[PDB]
Design a protein around this ligand. Structure first.
Ligand SMILES: Nc1ncnc2c1ncn2[C@@H]1O[C@H](CSCC[C@H](N)C(=O)O)[C@@H](O)[C@H]1O
Ligand SMILES: [Zn+2]
Ligand SMILES: [Zn+2]
Ligand SMILES: [Zn+2]
Length: 430
């Protein structure tokens, strides 16, 4: 559109604006080059168009793929053929990672479509940065076993290029891949959007990437002047600059140097220390931060095998131990609270979930930017929890605060905004 590919010094390739864009303006949308629905969302969402419905039909062989109707099934078949039969043959042992699943889809799409797609207008998949020189042995070994898994499960319908070519491609996916989220930032699947991948990172982004099914769309969250580069955020903005740049060095191989990262303006309020008699020493804070970043990692591993009680305990005991130094507005406090809310939501313990939600909504607003999907998503969860617990007045308020951010982020007309407005109306009469 009114945009340009250029060389951003120290940032590689980037997107710059040829015209002014106001807050909420659509920069462009980009269709998905390749995409997959997560194993867990099978049945809830159409495998093809990513539409959440309760009346889906399944395949007459695998029974593991679900579609709106015949039309969605035929259109998805070239991609689904890759698994339908292997899911029957390997049955119990069918466990390729979502990266493998996605990479398969890319390789299939390259074979049936060697020419530049309408998804690669400025950046091509084959032009993706790979950072092969910066990868340690661990990552190279992960990639290697990804290749074997792909050979294992996908040999019956795909023809593989040489090993060294797949190494490049897998590195490209880990560096340019997108995850698709729904309203409540729930993980729907993985996808490639080559044109959106062109945008660089700021922890002060001027755009937001949103989704309308399998279509990605990019809207301005700040006034963009002609000549300015267009930035999204690759990461969750809640965390301190060090926690942020730790993730950026490890997954994308750079240190961010935007205004936020250079001045650390919001770092103090994020790691809020309890103001009290005998102010905790720099050593006791350094210890608790390490404990926090540590227990977060512990929890991430635990939530894949531990029971809800065990996970609730982790959240409770860590909250307790951190309480001695950290306020409730502290980011590491919010995290464990947010996790505990996840486990309450799993256990149909709606009242519990709501309490955690109330205790984390305000600090969220202070820590995130004004237009932030995390905030809107939290508002939405609160709105539906309130609304289901007979709190219609607080529910509507929370739902309207969601719409306020989403109108700018998703666009006034987004099917998500229709749903929310419809959830509001379902409780009133006029
Ligand atoms: N704020 C930033 N500072 C430096 N490099 C960045 C950056 N944001 C993104 N990058 C670089 O861009 C990659 C993400 S893909 C973005 C397109 C990329 N600039 C390209 O030339 O193809 C990252 O791996 C990183 O190397
Ligand atoms: Zn469909
Ligand atoms: Zn099938
Ligand atoms: Zn930054």
């Amino acid at each position: 559109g009114g945009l340009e590919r250029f060389c951003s010094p120290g940032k590689g390739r980037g997107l710059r604006a040829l015209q002014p864009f106001q807050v909420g303006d659509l920069l462009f949308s980009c269709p998905a080059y390749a995409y997959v629905l997560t194993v867990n969302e099978r049945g809830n969402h159409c495998e093809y168009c990513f539409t959440r419905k309760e009346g889906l039909s399944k395949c007459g062989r695998c029974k593991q793929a679900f579609y709106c109707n015949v039309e969605c099934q035929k259109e998805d078949w070239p991609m689904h053929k890759l698994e339908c039969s292997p899911m029957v043959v390997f049955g119990e042992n069918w466990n390729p990672s979502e990266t493998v699943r996605l990479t398969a889809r890319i390789l299939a799409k390259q074979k049936i479509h060697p020419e530049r797609t309408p998804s690669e207008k400025l950046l091509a998949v084959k032009e993706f940065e790979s950072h092969l020189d910066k990868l340690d042995n661990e990552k190279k070994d992960l990639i290697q076993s990804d290749i074997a898994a792909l050979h294992h499960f996908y040999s019956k319908h795909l023809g593989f290029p040489d090993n060294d070519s797949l190494v490049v491609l897998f590195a490209q996916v880990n560096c340019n891949g997108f995850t698709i989220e729904d309203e409540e930032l729930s993980h729907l699947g993985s996808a490639i959007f080559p044109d959106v991948a062109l945008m660089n990172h700021s922890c002060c982004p001027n755009v937001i990437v949103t989704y309308k099914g399998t279509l990605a769309e990019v809207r301005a969250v700040q006034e963009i002047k002609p000549g300015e580069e267009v930035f999204t955020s690759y990461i969750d903005l809640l965390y301190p600059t060090e926690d942020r740049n730790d993730r950026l060095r490890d997954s994308y191989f750079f240190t961010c140097e935007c205004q936020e990262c250079t001045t650390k303006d919001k770092d103090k309020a994020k790691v809020e220390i309890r103001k009290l008699s005998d102010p905790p020493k720099a050593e006791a804070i350094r210890d608790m931060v390490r404990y926090a970043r540590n227990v977060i990692e512990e929890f991430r591993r635990a939530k894949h095998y531990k029971s809800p009680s065990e996970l609730l305990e982790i959240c409770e005991l860590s909250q307790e131990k951190m309480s001695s130094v950290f306020e409730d507005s502290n980011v590491y406090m919010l995290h464990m609270m947010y996790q505990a809310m996840g486990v309450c939501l799993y256990m149909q313990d709606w009242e519990g979930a709501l309490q955690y939600g109330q205790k984390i909504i305000k600090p969220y607003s202070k820590h995130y930017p004004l237009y932030s999907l995390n905030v809107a998503s939290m508002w939405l969860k609160l709105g539906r929890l309130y609304m289901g617990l007979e709190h219609k007045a607080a529910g509507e308020k929370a739902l309207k605060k969601a719409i306020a951010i989403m109108e700018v982020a998703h666009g006034k007309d987004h099917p998500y905004i229709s749903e929310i407005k419809q959830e509001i109306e379902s409780h009133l009469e006029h």
